[model samples]
Target chain A: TTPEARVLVVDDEANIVELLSVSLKFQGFEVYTATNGAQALDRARETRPDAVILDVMMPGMDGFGVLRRLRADGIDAPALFLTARDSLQDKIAGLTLGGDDYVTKPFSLEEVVARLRVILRRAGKNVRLTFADIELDEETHEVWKAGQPVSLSPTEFTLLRYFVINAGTVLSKPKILDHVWRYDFGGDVNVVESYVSYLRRKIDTGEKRLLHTLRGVGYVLREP
Target chain B: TPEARVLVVDDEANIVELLSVSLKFQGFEVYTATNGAQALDRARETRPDAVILDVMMPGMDGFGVLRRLRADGIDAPALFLTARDSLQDKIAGLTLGGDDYVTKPFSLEEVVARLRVILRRAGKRLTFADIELDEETHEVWKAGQPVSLSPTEFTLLRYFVINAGTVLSKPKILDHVWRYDFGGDVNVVESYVSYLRRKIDTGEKRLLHTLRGVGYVLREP
Candidate 1:
């Protein structure tokens, strides 16, 4: 049975609050709304929503103050900040002060949902992912298959993270190198091939195939 | 598949209008820029195939624009025009990687011919299969492997790639392939092909094959 997921959306603007509320409702999630930070705190304490999507520029008790008060009250739900300021420092500050993801205002609704999904899945709330004997524990950085722990190197961990993030898409050699390695290494594209070989030897053995070599391209992680 | 797009960067409105009309009549889509600053913005947005740049301008001159373009990896062919044909002026323009140049008060025929040459030459060099060769650097790669070659070998390789799958004649090779009007009556083309064959056509891989009575062709063995 799937547990019910609740989202608390706090915004001063009626239009934005209504928009987020409707979008979340359509996605089969229970949605709640509050106009000001004070009301938001009341809702959080009363309902204890699974996640809170807070707008920064609010009239009564801004997002920063609300966040400080929420943490003081021991409300440990992941909070996503919605800010109109499109600054890199703003994002760093938000994430640094326990914010999950900041969706800058004038942003796409698809991107908002994407950020929320990544946060929620990472929190072990939803999303089903499986690859070989290495099952990801989203809440904790734990992995298990057949109830046995599988250790991965730092490079292997990053490679697996990229694979799970992209999931079904086939990654090319240049694409992998661009993401994993910085330099061109002159003309050594064989590094991608070598990494794939290492991943296969470590991860795939008698279980469902997790790593696949697509001849002309690089690799993809999937079940077959 | 359409005719190449051209951007004319000049400070004068009349010159831009004249070049736009003339280039449009020549079956090229023409864009315009009044000055260098605006030209950078327009180039970034439109990314025209080639640019006809005037070297002397009010602010951020053509050389500055060319420098920025090269830094951004936009190796688009640029034709610079100057009022004087001083040796230093030509050297300065060519040294910065400007493909071709023209002095002011010249016939339009020279301009069109130079433009056509640039377009045809640029069109010939393209990445194919899994191999790519940067014609400017003569860098060659095979299945992610860097294949090294000497200067003459590199020139022969580029010629084969530019005219891939076509049988090139020896006289035609002597005229354009060698690129030198040395006035010497010697079979240098045949000797160079033999030398290139030893480097490229040795081992099981045979791409540089001579067409007996014909000249040469490059393809999978």
Candidate 2:
């Protein structure tokens, strides 16, 4: 455990910051949360956390912008970025080079802590979790299918990781929402379906489908 | 689901079944009793985190049940079920602790929502944007200034805070805020939202927004 590791967690989504703040607090870290980049910059100055967990997409300034400002202010606190798209991996690669890291959304709270721990110097998941053709590297947060790389948003990656681990079992929408997203998130069930189709377009596009939707029931990932 | 335990105390067969099923679905471990005597017995073993008492029950009513329960050291907080027309004389002094009451013809959503308010009495305060809610005391404040709301209006706002940032459809609001049988109209939600907007959402930065053709979402603009 990183003793008294003060962390600044920022996100445009109120629910995201709230959930992250609570979980981080419970894990014995002093956490300060801000909803937007400006507020995050303001908070980083005021509270001065040892590290920051920032969401990439925000209204005014994105996570990268906030980190750049924080760095300019000479607050070189290590950061863990929560990004949606792996398309920005190149952008994040620059920061990760500076001893920072990132995770895609809809991530497991447990994984967030572990990643934060590693960045926080507490050091933490299996190196990889694989099912069928898809391979997920837990430590590096990379994924590949049939030896070909496919980019996934953090939430998409999080959802697929859950599907791969529980490949045989049919996961109801509620179950997927509970596991993949924040449980207290009062979101529509359609979001689950939406993410499923997003995932389907990727690896499931092949002739042999691994992800199957049971009509009127739920979705499952199994070798067919 | 809070994953908390609840004891549902009501004499009406249908009401007890309704609450038990709903609470169970919401991930609460529920125990039920039809009468005050049985309520005390069930509570002793089940050891509920909260109790839902029907104040109008026959023979050793909810007040007596709660009184006896508290005196015996079973001090779980309670949400009393009171008829809309019921006098305040009986309901008064019942909620001296982290307790509350919901008028009869209450929505299942309202019951569970209010029950949560009492159960979460530990942290007691809920804040979003500039608005703050005192869950135990039912006091609301906007940017540090006090604001008043009618009972129904307060419940609706509390529901909003509990599910803050989540888009709620008119039907979802109706399902949770009102006794489902009456008014089948979404107008009541609109009326209350308008009233609430006038009171709390008066700031330049509006928090409640209606998503055209969809639903309402409460978030910071």
What DockQ does each candidate score versus the true complex, computed on alpha carbons? 0.00, 0.01
Best by TM-score: 1
User: Clashes in each model (backbone N, CA, C under 3 Å)?
Assistant: 0, 3
lDDT of 1 by residue, B1-221 (tens): 34888888989888788888888887898888887667777788878888888887886777888788767776778887665434333444642432666556544554565566556546744564445688776787765677787776677667777788889777776767557665455367788788766655554666767788877887766
lDDT of 1 by residue, A156-203 (tens): 665666788787899988888777755535467787787777767766
Once fitted onto the true fold, the runs of candidate 1 whose alpha carbons sit more than 4 angstroms away are A1-4, A86-91, A125-224, B1-221
- The CAPRI classification for model 2 reads as incorrect
Clashes of 1: 0
lDDT at A162, model 1: 73
At residue B85, what lDDT does model 1 achieve?
Answer: 35
Q: How many angstroms is residue B149 displaced in model 1 relative to the true structure, after the best TM-score fit?
A: 58
TM-score for predicted model 1 compared with the true structure: 0.30
